[PDB]
Design a protein around this ligand. Structure first.
Ligand SMILES: OC[C@H]1O[C@@H](O)[C@H](O)[C@@H](O)[C@@H]1O
Ligand SMILES: OC[C@H]1O[C@@H](O)[C@H](O)[C@@H](O)[C@@H]1O
Lengths: 765, 763
């Protein structure tokens, strides 16, 4: 009850086995008294007004006063807090390739969260966007393990204020959570929790590296994934939990299952016969906290009383959980909400500035047909058209109220200052040149659920969004507006009903009348010469009409080429509260774009998979009906200037004489970059390593380094890279990551496309 | 000769023991046989005579050649041979006896020409419809593939279980492509296969194990790299499974230049010396079309990298095969009289007709089928596939491209197109007017360059043809002047096979616009319409035919969905137009069922019926997960009523539960409730209710073609061994797990078409 050494938490001697259900984390709320009179150890989804009462109920109505560990989903900012700073999604953040600003966003988020009673965020997401059909692509940092590792490492440091494994969590910091460990992101058909046919070798190859990095850097907690991997759900997966996480990585953080993993193993996966055996196997597998599985309670108790489960294992789990709670000082200070600090830091002008500076880089200029940027004073009227041009809530995207996961913010984040594209462009960022909005099209029509208007409990079944019908009236109005304007700004994308859990998409196409809208607008632009720009605000890459990207035949033109299709192309994944202002600034030349793609755009769903790091061995390089050239490749993106690369050169680091490089050495390389245009810009220099010959089939190149490089007009910089030879690895059939002697190529340049890369070589022996 | 096991003889010179090579023939046999090859493939008909002559007259030791070639669905590249439907079309029939008859006839035609060996049947499983080689498979189900492949191996080898006395009218069978070649990344040709041991055992190995233990003559190792290891060097597949657990005693051969591809294409081996050494160490026998193996293996021995005794053991296995076939006494020279007697004989044509009559699936009947003959007076036969004989035959049939000695393809006089099937109607002059309607592809030169492959020209690449509104207008006028509209669409050989996977699965060219206009005419005038799909694999059809897709969509087989009736004939062979015509006119009742699932969109993949449990939700936010047509679907011209299935015995435990060694006996009644006789393919699926490791919810385990006269009822009886009700554990062990099982018997894989009972397994 006082400061003796934490080892004497062995005074767990008082917990009845009934109370050793400190392992449960239950959905609030809100009947905290019942939930806390249940010997629960954690609660999630606690409403802002009720975070005050939790620790009060602990201190005043419980036998032992064991403080709660309180967590919630603060996914890209304090998602479900009204008025908090809502940053871009993780995918949008990854467009920036800026670890420092992602870390700043994590620090600001933790600053806002740590003064409200929440100790813990279920973030960052380390899943890898390997299948564009997956509904949660917006939550990832893209399709590359290295980039995911860099950004996730930065954001864990931002959340936890630099605290490592075993240290005091600062008052303005929160616990980070690595999810979803592991392999949740490449399942059959891109479906939500379908089967993952991911061997140990493939998991180690493309899924584990970022998890291993943040685990060895002291990420506070880990969340176990939904899906069954090779017949075994992660909750019971010994190789992932024992051999990798606790074993090879020596991870000492706390684990928690995803939403009702144990129950789903029974009723959804048909893997466990009942909740008794499911609970027993979950405890035997080394689980710590159990999220939203009530039947685990009676499941574990009976499992012990029937001799199926040794109670000492439960004692060890409670020991780990209580170790986490004592480490955070919760027994002395449960970190109650701070009204003054809530008024002072949540939504502060400083956090708004951090959000703006991040989102200014979170937008990718994919094509410039020559008309960008537009000059304000040279025009008099701009047609802002498209259902995403003034949709604030869907601009924020999934995992931000009212996205659906909670209900205490039914109107979403306050409209008072979400900056939409209409608000920013240019109804804020230029004088009285007219800015006329036209909806142009609908995205989805809401139709009654075909299985009845009510659930069996009398509650009404919500309507289902389907691809909206084409409304020719909105197209005609949008066309008239465009013809009466000097510029056409089309804003299209998806909505939350098309994103997230259980909401994978198969076609990847824009729904509703958006394709017809873009067709008509492109027709007007071609006919009259009016400049046009298509702004895509979507949770993930989308298939655009041929009028915009060109036909995808057996042979097809490079989509980013200025003469392909009609108009310019900008991508802004889910740019947060300040996204419209940054989009406006880029369109008007106030801000130079500096985003690059962290994920590949497919031309068609049948092109999948389209990630840049393909495995060698294919016979041919085309489908008989579709080019294998993606619409936009990993690393693509443009500025408002031009850059010239010199040739890359190895400058040192090799210790053999020779040789030339040994496994413990580090490759030092240099390449010149020159701003050959008329305005300053930022080029994201990308460094890829390719193992020319491998004993086991592998990809031909992998991202290993990158740098955001700023250049004034005419300025040249020497970009220098340090790549450890220990990072130039492949994986063997037994999932061992090894450095293999032989020849390696180093490709440095503009994108993952080999035509955008300059090449040198080095040898490892 | 009189000796028994003294004959295999290392007088070879010093490595003439490169009997392990199998090189591409055409047309320099003397060099090839003096390269001391042990086998040749792609030998032209005129040259099959000269091979064994060159062996007997110009070689030092006179080791006879083992001669093989691709006889994929009939004697593919022999002019005038009986060309049966593709393996996928054959699988539409669900008729193992007729598939075996086709293999027996094929072997009869091949075994009199000098070829001893066919690279057939294909045991790959169509797990991704994007794959270019789906036409060569028996569908998407391991059990059906095992049944049909077993039957066709028995047909090829004349029942010889190897054995092996190979009869004079039989040829060696080849199980290909072992294994996992059919589910690679993106459905592309030999891209990476992320197939663990457990997944391989689960969905890919069963048919290979079956034909291996039944004595399939040879095995062919697949192109692709499995989990980083190409099959040519895959110890678990070759040693642990094939040679070890299965105790297989047949002969192995790599696919086309596997060893070289490991060097220049997969970048897995540093040079041909190490590639050859690793291939020999892995237990390979014959090496297909890798010349650099020669100097590659010799050097590997001379540098001590490869033990020569391993080569001696490989040569021992090959020569054991050659002695067992009696090639040292009779090399099986071509027989001009037997060629004149059996190749293309009327008996084989009849077998082909009886098979193809069942190889056609009636997928939707809007009510107008079958059409009555004497009541129609003009029919518009429209579509680019309505009279395309060569593309109706499909891939792996000259002129498909793999050989060059038949540049004009199989003789047109022997191919009945759908247009040709105007012989039946009505019968002499109700007019049958053909309209091309649309083009499929335009031929463009290969970028970049037409050589060096090497001096020979590189074939043109097909691109999606432009919509031709003039042909659409002509077809529309023809349709408006007719009593019936028969639209025949599909793909062509340039869109199927090796290096020719497809991503969109849609018809190319103006076929979609053509079908739209024809459907508009049919709706406007009430003229009946039928869409005949002649394509190598399932295709995505326009919304005018299958209905609009979306979050919710109508059942495509429902009579009121879309416009017109829908027939599928994958690649129906020489008698395909006659069978399609007979079915359209009611002369033959359709009895085909789908061996593969039709997706509505490529983004729906995978769509095979045996999905793994665990998904959160059951729809994409923009597309239903209901496929266009499910595995086992198909209709007849009558109706059937099912009773409830019942377990009737077989349990040996002393509490009524079933034991692992038992066999489940079940019965269900089937009644022809219509006005004409028909054949219903009764399907029996097993579902393990609870499994220790995630599994599918149902698997096909039995099926029977049941014939019924009007009003007739039969008791269909099934015997399903409990040893077949298995799952696979993390260590790739196929095990029977005690617990509750459901038995679903009925019309298709859709649970709404299945009736359900249960049984329990214990101990
Ligand atoms: O709400 C907490 C959890 O809910 C689940 O539905 C999601 O899969 C997790 O990403 C999330 O952390
Ligand atoms: O023609 C011989 C071989 O050629 C290869 O390209 C195919 O993959 C094999 O199926 C065939 O047996």
């Amino acid at each position: 009850a006082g400061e003796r050494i934490a080892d004497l938490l062995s005074r767990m001697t008082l917990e009845e086995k009934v109370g050793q259900m400190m392992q449960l984390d239950a959905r609030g709320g809100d009947l905290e008294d019942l939930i806390v009179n249940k010997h629960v150890g954690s609660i999630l989804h606690t409403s802002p007004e009720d975070l005050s009462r939790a620790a009060k109920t602990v201190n005043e109505k419980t036998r032992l006063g064991i403080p709660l560990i309180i967590g919630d989903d603060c996914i890209h900012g304090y998602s479900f807090w009204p008025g908090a700073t809502i940053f871009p999604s993780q995918l949008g953040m990854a467009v920036s390739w800026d670890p420092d600003k992602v870390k700043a966003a994590g620090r600001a988020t933790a600053e806002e969260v740590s003064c409200t009673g929440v100790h813990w965020t279920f973030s960052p997401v380390l899943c890898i966007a390997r299948d564009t059909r997956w509904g949660r692509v917006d939550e990832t940092f893209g399709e590359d393990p290295m980039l995911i590792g860099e950004l996730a490492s930065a954001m864990v440091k931002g959340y936890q204020g630099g605290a490592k494994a075993g240290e005091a969590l600062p008052k303005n910091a929160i616990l980070a959570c690595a999810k979803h460990f592991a392999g949740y992101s490449e399942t059959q058909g891109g479906r939500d929790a379908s089967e993952a046919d991911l061997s140990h070798r493939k998991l180690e190859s493309w899924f584990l590296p970022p998890f291993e990095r943040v685990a060895k850097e002291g990420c506070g907690t880990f969340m176990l994934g939904y899906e069954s991997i090779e017949g075994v759900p992660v909750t019971f997966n010994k190789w992932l939990l024992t051999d990798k996480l606790r074993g090879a990585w020596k991870y000492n953080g706390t684990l928690i299952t995803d939403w009702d993993n144990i129950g789903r193993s029974v009723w959804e996966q048909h893997v466990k016969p009942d909740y008794v055996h499911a609970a027993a196997d979950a405890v035997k597998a080394g689980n710590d906290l159990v999220m939203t599985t009530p039947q685990f309670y009676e499941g574990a108790i009976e499992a012990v009383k029937t001799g199926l489960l040794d109670e000492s294992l439960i004692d060890d789990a409670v020991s780990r959980i209580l170790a986490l709670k004592f480490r955070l000082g919760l027994f002395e200070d449960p970190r109650l909400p701070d009204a003054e600090r809530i008024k002072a830091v949540i939504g502060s002008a400083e956090h708004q500035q951090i959000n703006l500076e991040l989102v200014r880089e979170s937008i990718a200029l994919l094509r410039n047909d020559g008309a960008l940027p537009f000059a304000a004073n040279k025009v008099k009227r701009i047609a802002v058209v498209g259902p995403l041009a003034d949709d604030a809530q869907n601009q924020l995207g999934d995992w931000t109220g009212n996205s659906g996961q909670v209900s205490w913010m039914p109107d979403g984040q306050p409209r008072d200052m979400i900056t939409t594209v209409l608000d920013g462009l240019t109804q804020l960022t230029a004088d009285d040149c007219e800015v006329v909005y036209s909806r142009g099209a609908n995205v989805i029509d809401l139709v009654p659920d075909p299985a009845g208007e009510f659930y069996p409990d009398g509650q009404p079944r919500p309507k289902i969004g389907v691809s909206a019908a084409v409304d020719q009236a909105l197209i005609d109005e949008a066309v008239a507006n465009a013809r009466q304007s000097d510029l056409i700004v089309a804003v299209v994308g998806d909505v939350v009903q098309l994103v997230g859990e259980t909401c994978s998409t198969a076609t990847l196409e824009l729904l509703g009348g958006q394709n017809a809208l873009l067709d008509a607008l492109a027709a007007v632009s071609r006919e009259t010469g009016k400049p046009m720009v298509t702004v895509l605000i979507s949770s993930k890459p989308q298939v655009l009409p041929a009028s915009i990207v060109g036909e995808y035949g057996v042979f097809a033109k490079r989509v980013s080429d200025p003469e392909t299709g009609t108009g310019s192309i900008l991508w802004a994944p889910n740019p947060g509260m300040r996204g419209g202002q940054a989009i406006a600034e880029i369109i008007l030349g106030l801000t130079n774009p500096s985003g690059r793609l962290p994920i590949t755009f497919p031309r068609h769903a049948g092109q999948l998979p389209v990630y840049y790091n393909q495995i060698r061995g294919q016979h041919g390089d085309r489908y008989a009906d579709l080019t294998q050239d993606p619409a936009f490749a990993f690393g693509e993106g443009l500025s408002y200037t031009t850059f010239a690369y010199g040739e890359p050169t190895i400058v040192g680091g090799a210790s053999n004489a020779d040789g030339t490089f040994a496994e413990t050495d580090t490759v030092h390389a240099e390449i010149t970059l020159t701003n050959t245009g008329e305005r300053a810009g930022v080029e994201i220099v990308q460094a890829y390593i390719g193992d020319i010959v491998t004993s086991y089939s592998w990809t031909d190149r992998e991202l290993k380094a990158f740098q955001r490089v700023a250049l004034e007009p005419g300025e040249t910089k020497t970009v220098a890279f340090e790549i450890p030879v220990a990072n130039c690895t492949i994986v063997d059939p037994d999932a061992n990551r090894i450095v293999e002697p032989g020849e390696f190529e180093l490709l440095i340049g503009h994108s993952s496309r080999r035509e955008d890369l300059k090449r040198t070589t080095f040898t490892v022996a």
